[PDB]
Amino acid sequence: VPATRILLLVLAVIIYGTAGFHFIEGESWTVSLYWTFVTIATVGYGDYSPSTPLGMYFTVTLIVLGIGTFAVAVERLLEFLISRHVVICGWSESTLECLRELRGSEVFVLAEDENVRKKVLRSGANFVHGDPTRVSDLEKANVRGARAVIVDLESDSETIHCILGIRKIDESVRIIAEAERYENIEQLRMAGADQVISPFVISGRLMSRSIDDGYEAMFVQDVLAEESTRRMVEVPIPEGSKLEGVSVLDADIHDVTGVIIIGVGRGDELIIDPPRDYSFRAGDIILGIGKPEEIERLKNYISA
Amino acid sequence: SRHVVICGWSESTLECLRELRGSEVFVLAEDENVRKKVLRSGANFVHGDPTRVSDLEKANVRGARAVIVDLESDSETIHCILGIRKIDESVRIIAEAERYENIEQLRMAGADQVISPFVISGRLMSRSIDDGYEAMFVQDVLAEESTRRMVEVPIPEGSKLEGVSVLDADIHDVTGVIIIGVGRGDELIIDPPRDYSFRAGDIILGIGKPEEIERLKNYISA
Amino acid sequence: VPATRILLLVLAVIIYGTAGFHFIEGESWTVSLYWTFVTIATVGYGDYSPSTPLGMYFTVTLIVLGIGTFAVAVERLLEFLISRHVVICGWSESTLECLRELRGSEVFVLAEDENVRKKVLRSGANFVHGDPTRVSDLEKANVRGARAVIVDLESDSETIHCILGIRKIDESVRIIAEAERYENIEQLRMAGADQVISPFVISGRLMSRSIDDGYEAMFVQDVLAEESTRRMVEVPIPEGSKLEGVSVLDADIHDVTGVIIIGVGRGDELIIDPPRDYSFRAGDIILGIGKPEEIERLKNYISA
Amino acid sequence: VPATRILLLVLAVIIYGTAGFHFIEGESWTVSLYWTFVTIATVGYGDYSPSTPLGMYFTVTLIVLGIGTFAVAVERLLEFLISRHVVICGWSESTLECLRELRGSEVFVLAEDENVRKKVLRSGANFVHGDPTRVSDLEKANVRGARAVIVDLESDSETIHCILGIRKIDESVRIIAEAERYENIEQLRMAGADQVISPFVISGRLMSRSIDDGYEAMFVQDVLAEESTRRMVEVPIPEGSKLEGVSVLDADIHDVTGVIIIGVGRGDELIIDPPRDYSFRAGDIILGIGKPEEIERLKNYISA
């Protein structure tokens, strides 16, 4: 029964009880209203009660008509009383490890399966039931106010559909997609994903390079883990630093600090192992590998 | 050299078979309907069940040099690894973990190298919320088309760097190769300290242009 | 709704009611707390009640906000107030008959399907929902303290995986497995199973030995059924018995007791039809067939 | 929770409340018992109530521990205070028309589908949920006390399994089975069905005989319908009639009555169009076609 109808029914009982007690027993409107609540809630203090046969009969009628109505009303009332975030579309193993690495941030999960809510709520993320390809269910999960949306659906067609729905909602949010097949990388970039992470291509190239000796797979799976002594972090060159215009050959960052400068990125372009006459700017993102003491020393070296 | 056996068929083994053009590959899988897509990649197809020791001994595991095990689930991968270790106890096994919990079980069961793609994908997803230079680095250093290549260069016996520390060797200014790790045996030391003295038999893992790779090979030559 | 949240909500109602009655009606904090419980539980003794219009209005608000909250709280409270075990991994026919014979003990059935819950609880076992290959879902089902774990899963690879998981958890528990194929008996024993039972090998050998006349299948399926007259019993030799150091030729069990000595066991080995020079020891297990009167005569025969 | 455990729990609450009120508030054991019931039932007359702070605290504890316990107890108590038939196994169209023709008799329906209960209860038959091949579900539907069991399952293997289950329960009941394929008629008779009705063989032979002109299909579908003027009924020859030893050539039943004697059956054998020297007996079942006036005339002619 709609909650609003139950509201009207309980109000009608309240009017009936209050008017009846007032007219039959002669108590004030306020006392009569109070007595009606006390009676239909089954509290029954007995500070007020009928003293006439008509009042006794009336009270039995109010008991029968009112107690059930009030009970249903209170239970319905119960129901109504009782940087930014990251939205994850779909539930897989890749999103499971991403949600493991995303502790401390607010994470929504938009998935179709209802029987994953226990593992989503145990991993530390709010679960939003829905279809990620539909714009209304995409919208509910707060895609507008997010800072990044991570799309990992069952196929590449559904992933492209989800990316186009998110681009219909917000044209400025960041989309991180996952390619299940190799040839759909450029199509997932055409749809609007800001970065496409193809795990089976990385896995196949590591399994191909691990025939002779597997040092490349050890390097990748060790520096991506936040458990080793060396960590891959990106330091930015601040506005007004000592390094503007200075090339990497004049800098010798590995000589003065001890971090390994493996790449310098600007915008959305990265040049791995840059040549010696590459002139630094303000805003270039330095990608390096070193211990956190060396990382703090590198931050103190490139300071303003 | 010898052949390479691939047990099971998926996308990981498909890209691994693409990167193994020029070599001999036996593919062992239950599906008969993959014979064209195996055979168009230059691989000899062998029908069978990879978990069974008879269908394993069909596909020449004894004479192989490396076995790549990527089956449909992780229990099947551990069963097939046990079936391989029944036959040849010293062949190199490269597995693939579909779950993070099963890596120590796949290494206890006998796999020399366990490569878990979903853990790498989750860690590259979570680190690309701000900007994805790490995922760009990982996905661009592995492709065999780019300008810079990650290579393994062995140190020969009688070289010029026996006992020489990495500070006095001065690899980056002389050659141009970024030295990200020096490996030995079954350990890899990423960013080795300045007191690290080399040994004849170490593996230098580096990144550089192929001219710098030739200069590094001519620089460490005996 | 989580039980702890309901706890907070009812506490908030209690604070609201107690403070309100104290300030509006002027009763002590203790009386006000008592009145609040009496009211929101709908007991309503009427020893205390509001005597002012404001108190009457306040009481109606407490009735509406508090009665439902208290009702939900008490029902949630209800739930918390209201040898060793055996774990069975997987649900099939073999584990069903094993559960039929294992009445009286505590059995935890770990299974992937949720629809097997009613038949597991009707067979007399506590159902634990989970995946038997996962290590955490094994540790949920109390594998650490059990005295035997029975593994029978869908395939043989899943059985080897569950055995490896149990051996990662506990290195002392007894594992009984079921092999689907003849080739995997040695792999299941290497992976750590204390006993491997292969039903299809027994069935194939009985079907091949039942061509001429099937007395072998009748013998096996009659001595294993605990409804016949004869039972296959294991009778252990105690320390200090009369038979330490006698041969089985000189002991002469069958004519003096009535049992049939088909085999003797020690540790993890079994000697079927032991030769006459076999000298008995202490701690040996005697495997025999006989009527229970003969079994008790053999038990009194081997006493200290 | 077992009803008896709930009983113990409520008794324990009653002891707790009664002893507490007696010792803390000093009322008699009888008054204390009465107060405890009045309180945990939430009646709360207020003729007795605590007057000490300890009594107030105790009463709040009794309210919390007792109201839920009493509520669960009363609801459990509620539960304890508050020719032959024809069993049909399976639900099809043939059983639907059979259930249409079986009005006025008590019909059970044993079927696996839960979402047929509305049409079974609308057709006038009690629905028994279950698997017809299982002996326990066969048993529940009262196969023992039935007079006929009608088996119409999805295939012939399930039909034979159901027939063998019914023959395991009762070896004297009547089984009417339906063959889905032609070659399984003798196997459905071997399993134990008393009569096998193969509808697709009848339909195929009528569709084969209806090429030229369809008088045979009109005859069959008209005399089987209880709507025409002529009806196919079986009259039995009573013990001690005028027709014993008299042949059909000496009888001339069609001359004296007007029914068409198309067959005479004994036991489970029927001879269609019997020859002239066929001697009648007592117990032979006459199969004829005629108007009900001719049927009553035939009953009056063969009387004792």
Residues in chain D: 304
* Rounded Cα distance, C32 and C40, in Å: 12
SS3 C107: strand
- List strands edge to edge, sheet with C86-89: C126-129, C107-111, C86-89, C148-151, C175-178, C195-197
* C-alpha of C27 from chain center: 56
* Rounded Cα distance, A247 and B174, in Å: 17
As a three-state string, the secondary structure of chain B is CCCEEEECCCHHHHHHHHCCECECEEEEECCCCCHHHHHCCCCEEEECCCCCHHHHHHCCCCCCCEEEECCCCHHHHHHHHHHHHHHCCCCEEEECCCCCCCHHHHHHHCCCEECCHHHHHHHHHHCCCCCCHHHHHHHHHCCCCCCCEEEEEECCCCCCCCCCEHHHHCHHHHCCCEEEEEEECCEEEECCCCCCECCCCCEEEEEECHHHHHHHHHHCCC
Half-sphere exposure of A281 (CA within 13 A, CB side): 7
For residue C279, the distance in angstroms to the closest alpha carbon of chain B comes to 39
Cβ <8 Å between C46 and A47: yes
Residues of A within 8 A of C57 (CB-CB) are 34
SS3 C86: strand
What is the DSSP annotation of A80-120?
HH----EEEES--HHHHHHHHHTTTS-EEEEES-GGGHHHH
* Rounded Cα distance, A134 and D277, in Å: 85
* Rounded Cα distance, D1 and A71, in Å: 25
* C-alpha closest to that of C63 among C80, C40, C31: C40
Number of CB pairs < 8 Å for A and D?
7
- Strands (E) in chain D, as ranges, are 86-89, 107-111, 126-129, 148-151, 174-178, 195-197, 231-236, 260-266, 269-272, 285-290
- Per-residue burial over B126-152, b = 16 or more CB atoms within 10 Å of its CB, e = otherwise: bbbbebbbbbbbbbbbbeeeeebbbbb
* Rounded Cα distance, D256 and D263, in Å: 17
Q: Which residues of D touch C (CB under 8 A)?
A: 1, 9, 39, 42-46, 49-50, 53, 56-57, 59-60, 63-65, 67-69, 72
Q: Is A117 exposed, middle or buried (0-12, 13-18, 19+ CB in 10 A)?
A: middle
Residue A85 Ramachandran class (φ > 0 left, ψ -120 to 50 alpha, else beta):
beta
Residue D279 DSSP class: B
Measured CA to CA in angstroms, residue C92 lies from C139, C181, D130 at distances of 22, 17, 21
Rounded to 5 degrees, φ, ψ at C233 are -120, 150
- Structure-block tokens of residue A247: 């090339």
Residue A283 DSSP class: S
Query: What does the radius of gyration of chain A's CA atoms come to, in whole angstroms?
Result: 33
Residue C237 DSSP class: P
CA-based nearest residue in chain D for residue C42: D42
* Rounded Cα distance, C138 and C122, in Å: 23
Q: Is A16 exposed, middle or buried (0-12, 13-18, 19+ CB in 10 A)?
A: middle
What is the DSSP annotation of A43-57?
----SS---SHHHHH
Q: Which residues, other chains included, contact D247 with Cβ-Cβ below 8 Å and sequence gap of 6+?
A: D276, D277, D278, D279, D280
* Rounded Cα distance, A263 and B134, in Å: 9
Residues of C within 8 A of A74 (CB-CB) are 64, 67-68
* Rounded Cα distance, B197 and D179, in Å: 88
Instruction: With both helix axes pointing from N to C terminus, report the angle between C3-25 and C53-81 in degrees, rounded to the nearest 10.
Output: 150
Cβ <8 Å between C155 and B75: yes
Q: Nearest CB to A206: which of B115, B118, B135?
A: B115
Neighbours of chain A (3+ CB pairs under 8 A): B, C, D
Which value in Å is the resolution of this experimental model?
4.9
Q: Which residues of C are annotated as a binding site for Ca(2+)?
A: 152, 178, 180
Q: Is D244 exposed, middle or buried (0-12, 13-18, 19+ CB in 10 A)?
A: middle
| Strand D269-272 versus strand D260-266 pairing type | antiparallel
All domains of chain B, ordered by start, with CATH?
A: 2-116 (3.40.50.720), 117-144 (1.20.5.870), 145-222 (3.30.70.1450)
Residues of B within 8 A of C134 (CB-CB) are 101
Neighbours of chain C (3+ CB pairs under 8 A): A, B, D
- Structure-block tokens of residue B61: 């595991």
- Structure-block tokens of residue C122: 């009707």
For residue B34, the distance in angstroms to the closest alpha carbon of chain A comes to 17
As a three-state string, the secondary structure of D147-207 is CEEEECCCCHHHHHHHHHHHHHHCCCCEEEEECCCCCCHHHHHHHCCCEEECHHHHHHHHH
* Rounded Cα distance, D53 and D58, in Å: 9
Cβ <8 Å between D45 and A46: yes
* Rounded Cα distance, B191 and A291, in Å: 9
CA-based nearest residue in chain A for residue D47: A46
* Rounded Cα distance, A304 and A299, in Å: 10
Q: Is C275 exposed, middle or buried (0-12, 13-18, 19+ CB in 10 A)?
A: exposed
* Rounded Cα distance, C258 and C289, in Å: 9
Cβ <8 Å between A213 and B139: no
Q: Which residues of C touch A (CB under 8 A)?
A: 1, 9, 39, 42-46, 49-50, 53, 56-57, 59-60, 63-65, 67-69, 72
Question: H helices within chain A, ranges in order?
Answer: 3-25, 29-40, 53-81, 93-101, 117-123, 135-140, 156-169, 185-191, 199-209, 215-223, 248-251, 253-256, 292-301
| Strand C126-129 versus strand C107-111 pairing type | parallel
Residue pair D301/D241 in contact by the 8 Å Cβ criterion: no
CA-based nearest residue in chain A for residue C41: A43
SS3 C194: coil
How many Cβ atoms sit within 10 Å of the Cβ of residue D207? 11
* Rounded Cα distance, C230 and C259, in Å: 10
**Amino acid (one-letter) located at A201:** V
Q: What's the angle, vertex CA A224, arms to CA A223 and CA A230, rounded to 5? A: 30
Residue C12 DSSP class: H
For residue B53, the distance in angstroms to the closest alpha carbon of chain A comes to 22
**Does an interface of 3+ CB pairs under 8 Å exist between B and D?**
no
Q: Nearest CB to D42: which of C34, C43, C77?
A: C43
Q: Nearest CB to A221: which of B12, B120, B139?
A: B120
Residues in chain A: 304
- Strands (E) in C39-103, as ranges, are 86-89
Rounded to 5 degrees, φ, ψ at A270 are -125, 130
- Structure-block tokens of residue A262: 């493996």
* Rounded Cα distance, C259 and B131, in Å: 81
Number of CB pairs < 8 Å for B and C?
38
Cβ <8 Å between C46 and A46: yes
- Structure-block tokens of residue C45: 């003794």
* C-alpha closest to that of A44 among C44, C285, C63, D172: C44
Q: Which residue has the tokens 């149990």?
A: C166
Residue A265 DSSP class: E
Q: What's the angle, vertex CA A228, arms to CA A225 and CA A229, rounded to 5? A: 140
Residue A235 Ramachandran class (φ > 0 left, ψ -120 to 50 alpha, else beta):
beta
How many Cβ atoms sit within 10 Å of the Cβ of residue D97? 10
Residue A239 DSSP class: T
* C-alpha closest to that of A23 among A11, A7, A41, A35: A35
Q: Is D128 exposed, middle or buried (0-12, 13-18, 19+ CB in 10 A)?
A: buried
| Strand D269-272 versus strand B203-208 pairing type | unpaired
* Rounded Cα distance, D10 and D3, in Å: 11
* Rounded Cα distance, C157 and B105, in Å: 13
Residues of C within 8 A of D114 (CB-CB) are none
Cβ <8 Å between B75 and C133: yes
Is A25 marked within a binding site?
no
Residue pair C191/C217 in contact by the 8 Å Cβ criterion: no
Q: Nearest CB to C41: which of D42, D45, D56?
A: D42
Residues in chain C: 304
Rounded to 5 degrees, φ, ψ at C291 are -70, 150
Q: Nearest CB to D59: which of C34, C74, C82?
A: C34
* Rounded Cα distance, A195 and A200, in Å: 16
Rounded to 5 degrees, φ, ψ at B151 are -130, 160
Q: Nearest CB to D46: which of C33, C45, C82?
A: C45
Cβ <8 Å between A45 and D46: yes
* C-alpha closest to that of B9 among B21, B37, B1, B23: B37
- Structure-block tokens of residue D299: 């009953």
Cβ <8 Å between A74 and C67: yes
How many Cβ atoms sit within 10 Å of the Cβ of residue D208? 9
Q: Which residues, other chains included, contact C129 with Cβ-Cβ below 8 Å and sequence gap of 6+?
A: C111, C114, C117
